Amino acid sequence: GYTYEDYKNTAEYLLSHTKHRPQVAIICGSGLGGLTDKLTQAQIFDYSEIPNFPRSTVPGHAGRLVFGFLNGRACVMMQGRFHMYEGYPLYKVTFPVRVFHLLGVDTLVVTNAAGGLNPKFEVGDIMLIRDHINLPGFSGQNPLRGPNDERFGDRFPAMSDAYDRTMRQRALSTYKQMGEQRELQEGTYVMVAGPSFETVAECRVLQKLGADAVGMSTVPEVIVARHCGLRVFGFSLITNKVIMDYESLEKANWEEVLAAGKQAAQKLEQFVSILMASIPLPD
Amino acid sequence: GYTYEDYKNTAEYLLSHTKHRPQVAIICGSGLGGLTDKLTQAQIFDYSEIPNFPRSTVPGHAGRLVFGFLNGRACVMMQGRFHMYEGYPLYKVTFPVRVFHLLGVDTLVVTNAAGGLNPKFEVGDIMLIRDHINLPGFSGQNPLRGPNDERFGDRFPAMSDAYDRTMRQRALSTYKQMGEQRELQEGTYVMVAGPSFETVAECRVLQKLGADAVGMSTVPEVIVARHCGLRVFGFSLITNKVIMDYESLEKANWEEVLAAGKQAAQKLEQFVSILMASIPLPD
Amino acid sequence: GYTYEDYKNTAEYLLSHTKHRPQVAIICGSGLGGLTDKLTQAQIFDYSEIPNFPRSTVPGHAGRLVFGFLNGRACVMMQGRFHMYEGYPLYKVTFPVRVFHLLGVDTLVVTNAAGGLNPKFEVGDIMLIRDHINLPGFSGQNPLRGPNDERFGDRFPAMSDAYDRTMRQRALSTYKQMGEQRELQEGTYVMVAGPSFETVAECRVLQKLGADAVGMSTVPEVIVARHCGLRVFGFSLITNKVIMDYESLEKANWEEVLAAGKQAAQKLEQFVSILMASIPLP
Ligand SMILES: Nc1nc2[nH]cnc2c(=O)[nH]1
Ligand SMILES: Nc1nc2[nH]cnc2c(=O)[nH]1
Ligand SMILES: Nc1nc2[nH]cnc2c(=O)[nH]1
DSSP states (O other): OOOOOHHHHHHHHHTOOOOOOOSSEEEOOOTTTTTGGGGGEEEETTTTTSSSSOOOTTTTTTOOOEEETTEEEEEEEEESSOOGGGTTTTEEEEEEHHHHHHTTTEEEEEEEEEESSSSOTTTTEEEEEEEEEHHHHTTTTTTTTTTOTTTOOOOOOOTTTTTTTHHHHHHHHHHHHGSSSSSOOOEEEEEEOOOOOOOOHHHHHHTTTTOOOEEEHHHHHHHHHHHHHHHHHHOOOOEEOOOOSSSSOOOOOOOHHHHHHHHHHHHHHHHHHHHHHHSOOOO | OOHHHHHHHHHHHHHTTTOHOOOOOOOOTOOOOOOGGEEEEEEEETTTSTTTOOOOOOOOOEEEEEEEEEEEEEEEEEEEEGGGTTOHHHHHHTTHHHHHHTOOEEEEEEEEEEEOOSTTOTOOOOEEEEEEEHHHHHHOOOTOSSSSSSTTTOOOOTTTOBOOOHHHHHHHHHHEEEEESSSOOEEEEOOOOOOSOOOOOHHHHHHHHHHEEEEEESSSHHHHHHHHTTTEEEEEEEEEEESSSSSSSOOOOOHHHHHHHHHHHHHOOOOHHHHHHHHHOOO | OOOOHHHHHHHHHHHHTOOHHHOOEEOTTTTTGGGGGGGGEEEEEEEETTTTTTOOOOTTTTEEEEEEEEETTTEEEEEOOOGGGOOHHHHHHHHHHHHHHTTTOOOEEEEEEEOSTTTOOTTOOOEEEEEEEEEHHHTTOTTTOOOOOTTTOOSSSOOOBBBBBHHHHHHHHGGGOOOOSHHHSEEEEEEEOSOOOOHHHHHHHHHHHHHHHEEESSSSHHHHHHHOEEEEEEEEEEEEOOOOSSSOOOOHHHHHHHHHHHHHHHHHHHHHHHHHHOOOOO
């Protein structure tokens, strides 16, 4: 897909057009549509402005990067993403992450919506990602497929420690501060390609494999971030409880997902800000 | 792959060249090679005649759509299909289904051959598909991958109710009429890409995941049908019992599959006809 | 990808440029032994020389086929392979296997490195592959995908008997001779695409599915070999034990893998030679 130069050009373009120098990249999933509003000294770039950036044909906008400070933390926020189910190859899906690395970002925060597989979870819960199961990865759909560039990382990176232990500990503490009724969940996120929702039998399979939440994103980004050495922290908003029996007349649907994203908007906004304080300083 | 126009053209061609107006599409799998013979007022179209239709290089024929009445039921029958293992992309495999929708069909009946994973199953059994596990789908091989057309259906369709409850109830009753020794089985169908047959370890994996039968087709069609609102009903002829241990010297083989398809031909022909009576009338 | 001609040309080129006529092809695992040194009457071909052969951009060399005798057994050895994770399509990954068949080879020995999923395995163990779980295969990534050529094999080949039971029984049988403290393991190999290593959750998934060892190669080759009638035998050097819990601070890494491949080099070299004696005659 892209050459090392391509990534470098894209980073140079951004670096030369802003004085912001982000430590943390945040990929906004459902419910963080409005997180930019909490940025101070915001500066926007549209994907159409940025060289080599792929573009969503999705009607509203191409999407944007927004630099700024979140609780005095120097960050870049990514709004609008690319998904495997939309037809994008994985090197396009994960293009931004390699760019962030070249911006000198050292921490990636990924968020998403997911269906709850774990019976304890409730719509509205936040689940810290402790680990993932990369089903597309097993079959070949891994973003690192192809020639490896030692300037980014190793030919065979490890994923057993992908989700930073310390940030999860600190996240667990600091969540008490918000004084929420439901606690912070923690669990395994499984990635499926989508875009259709799971059958009952499929949900049962995912449960047996050990997954607590299922979604259609995030994992490829995590793998690329880890490949180039970034610290990674992630979580899912449980937006619906996956159907697990044939009796129910309920069905997963996207409007439900958006509604859940709205209810949780503030909780999520609050939580990401707080979390900024927990992030270690550069080096 | 195709544009909305393409589908529309193909449907218009067919609609303008026949007065038949099918309610039910039937995709014939093994053992239904001769089901066209029970059609009254038959009218054939070869795939070579039909605009935008993909074509099998398989030597005998391109294959054909045959309109007609089966037990006075207005239907179109599809003979010869396209498979993922043959190299076809999924939007080609499932092209006919979208066309059937545009013909005003509202019920899809899919049939196939499958290996028996459930120890209770016997060669010759018919298994009603209650649900499926779409393994290729997990990895990205989903026919709906790419831009969604809202003229067909939603961006994120649900599959939890894919196989019509009522049809299955009615099918279970009406099977008594044939007075068969072995009863109607019901279970989960798993799709694997093929074309090689499962190892023992793989068979055990598919059993653990909860599958009763394994095949190499059908699921992409079902997903597309449901996406555009069709009622779906399906079943598998158990043509062989998958090897489950290292002692056996038996091996799956395609001649065995064809033989089973032949033994069952009449039972199957009978069953599909009967079933026509059970189908609801056009809403 | 390739036509039947292409395969034939490549075979004709090789046949016409050597008098060696191998019975056994051996694919030396990426991470494993430089066993060519034990070949007598060696004759090398570089991949660059051979028509239609794909080529590794990997800096050191394209890689080579080396004909010869190993314990008086007429064989061809393949050093350097192609992997799905490198971007190669499967028909390129398995191209050599089809060519071996056309050379008149009738037995394929495949070896590789693998991470240990079964708690009983120890770094250094050899695991005979009794069976495999082809995960990419389930999703479409099967090397036989596309039109079938009946000149090679059936449209729907069976894999339930892929790994020759006699060769395994003999291997385990004569292993006594390998006067090792530790014995010959036997198990299920699972293929995953790679190139990144498994998480803990994935490890547990693969364990539940019944796999004993996990790797990123071999299976496509085996599928192609069996499609054209070859006898297949295969084994894995357990080069590391896959991380199974969140507490550990160990991580899989490729240097560990190369180290283990080094410690085991002689044990492996010895074992393959011995095995030559066990192979049936044409
Ligand atoms: N695959 C999948 N993704 C989701 N994202 C939000 N809910 C769901 C779900 O139920 N399934
Ligand atoms: N994968 C698969 N497909 C089939 N079609 C008919 N029998 C079988 C079988 O045993 N396995
Ligand atoms: N996937 C995989 N392949 C390997 N080859 C050697 N070790 C490993 C491992 O731990 N995982």
